[PDB]
Design an enzyme around this catalytic site. Sequence first.
Site, PDB file in Angstrom:
ATOM      1  N   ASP A  35      -3.308  28.209   1.101  1.00  0.00           N
ATOM      2  CA  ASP A  35      -4.274  29.231   0.694  1.00  0.00           C
ATOM      3  C   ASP A  35      -5.588  28.552   0.308  1.00  0.00           C
ATOM      4  OD1 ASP A  35      -5.666  31.400  -0.267  1.00  0.00           O
ATOM      5  OD2 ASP A  35      -4.336  31.748  -1.979  1.00  0.00           O
ATOM      6  N   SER A 199     -22.578  33.309   7.107  1.00  0.00           N
ATOM      7  CA  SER A 199     -22.615  33.585   8.534  1.00  0.00           C
ATOM      8  C   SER A 199     -23.988  34.116   8.927  1.00  0.00           C
ATOM      9  CB  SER A 199     -21.524  34.590   8.909  1.00  0.00           C
ATOM     10  OG  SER A 199     -21.660  34.996  10.259  1.00  0.00           O
TER      11      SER A 199
END
Length: 330
Positions: A35, A199
Amino acid sequence: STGSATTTPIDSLDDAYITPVQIGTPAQTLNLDFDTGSSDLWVFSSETTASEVDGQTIYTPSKSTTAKLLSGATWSISYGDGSSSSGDVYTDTVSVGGLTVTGQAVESAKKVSSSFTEDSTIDGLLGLAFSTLNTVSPTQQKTFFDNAKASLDSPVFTADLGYHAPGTYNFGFIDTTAYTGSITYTAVSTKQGFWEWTSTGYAVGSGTFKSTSIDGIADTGTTLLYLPATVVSAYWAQVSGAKSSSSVGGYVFPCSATLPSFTFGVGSARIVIPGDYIDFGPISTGSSSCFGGIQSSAGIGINIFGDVALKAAFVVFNGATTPTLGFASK
Ligand SMILES: NCc1ccc(C(F)(F)F)cc1
Ligand SMILES: NCc1ccc(C(F)(F)F)cc1
């Protein structure tokens, strides 16, 4: 030194991936969920409330000659989905794919939430975010990656997740046969403890790329892709019959539809998620409504590039003094 381990989807929808991890002496092998969105290594153990264990393999510190109770240390974690667990702390030897760390904090669960108990294939979590998020009190503990960093050939690990297929986590080296083209690196902010990056935009299907900054986290521990409401609405508008359902808790679509791809920007590079990756199948057995793999982050507070996005790429987690994230097509 290096390590390499195969990671395997737990079911036919790629809801999560498990990776075998050796804990203790002699080795006890547990299948952990790696994770990058959390920083605790916790396991089902002989100390877990017996009614809360249902098929998991348990860590038994009393059978490990290298286990030591960390006197007075406790841990308690709550995940963004409402899951939680807590217990005490041992140190022990931990090995991943040949890479061994001694004195790693192994957090032993005394209580686990229902969603973990029902997931009989996951024996625990191995956190790979930054150590500032570790929940051990009063003395915060380091992650497996942080403890291994010094002895790694390079301070990196890579995630190569498969679509309905096994993949690979590598520690300490970059497999240049596992991707095509070049790796595009982008800056990471550690201010919240996550692998957080920006992004550069998105496209739906063969539509025009929309340049716009989307701040979000690279999280192997989250199944789906969670993006701002404006982006998610523009995606599902291209799917005939798709709608947001309050009773289901997200966008659903007619199972007979064909889904468009989704492109996200990394600097000047583009990563394309095939439409089939966004299909998470019927909401209930026999239903003709299917659950979408791209959902709104509005209720969450942060955008999450989960497995749906990451499995479309070869991803480098560069833990150098100035951390960066690398993305390549594959
Ligand atoms: N995979 C760990 C995780 C879970 C939840 C969140 C959230 F929701 F807080 F962003 C981040 C990281
Ligand atoms: N994002 C961390 C995480 C990972 C898996 C689970 C589940 F599915 F096992 F409940 C919960 C939270």
